[PDB]
């Protein structure tokens, strides 16, 4: 049970087709900076980490990304979800040379290093659910928040 992690209403958002990888990270990190969950330059360190250590997961049907940085830049535990209209290509976390067309981003900000695998385990459980991920593509910001908040509180 991934406990002790914050999740507010403004943490869910939709992004247009014109956005790139770095625009998505900046957009998903903006609510975290305002609430004081991460440092002011949190988005910058997430971009640099993504270039060296990709977080794209080519899961069927909907591709997933888990962009993040070190626990050094996280003040409080939090997660922000980002949905895309058109698929944006993230690099493979497994190291394979094929691209991962991501439509759903789970930006993780975790202060405790020892709690990382709990979050990953929780993400891996959610993304395997084919019915749930299909709903996230159609659901609006208010509908996504209620679905994730219920899943998170277990």
């Amino acid at each position, epitope marked *: *049970a991934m*406990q*002790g992690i914050h999740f507010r209403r403004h943490y869910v958002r939709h992004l247009p087709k014109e956005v790139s990888q770095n625009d998505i990270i900046k957009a998903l990190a903006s609510p975290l900076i305002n609430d004081g969950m991460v440092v002011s330059d949190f988005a910058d360190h997430v971009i640099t980490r993504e270039q060296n*250590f990709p*977080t794209g997961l080519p899961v069927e049907p909907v591709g997933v990304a*888990i962009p*993040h940085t*070190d*626990s050094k830049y996280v003040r409080q535990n939090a997660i922000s979800v980002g949905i895309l209209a058109e698929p944006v290509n993230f690099e493979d*976390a*497994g*190291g394979e040379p094929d691209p991962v067309p991501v439509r759903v981003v789970f930006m993780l900000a975790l*202060g*405790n*290093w*020892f*709690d*990382i*695998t*709990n979050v*990953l*385990w*929780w993400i*891996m459980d959610v993304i395997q659910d084919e019915d749930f991920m299909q709903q996230l593509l159609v659901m609006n910001d208010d509908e996504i928040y209620q679905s994730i908040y219920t899943r998170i509180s277990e």
Partner: antibody, heavy 125, light 106 residues
């Protein structure tokens, strides 16, 4: 079960570096945290650092920050630890450890359920 | 940063008696990030308790962890000759993780 087979003991001189390996098997490799714990003769345990192989997120303690490098090869399910600038203080048994999981065969717990046999590194000249 | 000070340093009991080992923290550690280990001579540490109270697989009922915040306790209720070992407490609520100095039960 989960097994962690470490490399053999080594005898290095002061100044040189040492690289100990930790071959993991039995469970999933990438999705769980691998830690490195040290124990000098009759001294007790100290956490050097660790790594989660999936995203290569290595973490270090401030004391060994700089002279310690922990990596994980996903293609061979092996974790490594390279301690540089070796001194007499570094003479200890080096353990690699992996976090357990809740229930039988489960969500990760954090605490080190599985440990390697240990690698005795001795520093002298 | 967070130092764990265990007590007693050494203990000697008879088989069947209860053994109350303590582990005090310098700062408030969350209950979900506290674990106890058993280390016999020549062997690696065996995980007994994790998350303050939760007991690892294969560990019998006589071992029981309890505590919150600063004060933490490991209770070994019915001592067996096999329980003669050094016992460490660990915090993993933040980096760097730190262990206690250890308690030798004889």
């Amino acid at each position: 079960q989960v097994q962690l087979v470490q490399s053999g003991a080594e005898v290095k001189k002061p100044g040189s570096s040492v690289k100990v390996s930790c071959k993991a098997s039995g469970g999933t490799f990438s999705s769980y945290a691998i830690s490195w714990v040290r124990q000098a003769p009759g001294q007790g345990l100290e956490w050097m650092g660790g790594i989660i192989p999936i995203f290569g997120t290595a973490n270090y303690a401030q004391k060994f920050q700089g002279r310690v490098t922990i990596t994980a090869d996903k293609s061979t399910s092996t974790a490594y630890m390279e301690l540089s600038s070796l001194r007499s203080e570094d003479t200890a048994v080096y353990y690699c450890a992996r976090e357990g999981t809740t229930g039988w065969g489960g969500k990760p717990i954090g605490a080190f359920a599985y440990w390697g046999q240990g690698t005795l590194v001795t520093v002298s000249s | 940063e967070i130092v764990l000070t265990q007590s007693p340093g050494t203990l000697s009991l008879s088989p069947g008696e209860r053994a109350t080992l303590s582990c005090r923290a310098s700062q408030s550690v969350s209950s979900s990030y506290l674990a106890w280990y058993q280390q016999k001579p020549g062997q690696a540490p065996r995980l007994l308790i994790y998350g303050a109270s939760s007991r690892a697989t294969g560990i019998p009922d006589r071992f029981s962890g309890s505590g919150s915040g600063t004060d933490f306790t490991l209770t070994i209720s019915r001592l067996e000759p096999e329980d003669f070992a050094v016992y460490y407490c660990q915090q993993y609520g933040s980096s760097p993780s730190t262990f206690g100095q250890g308690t030798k039960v004889e």
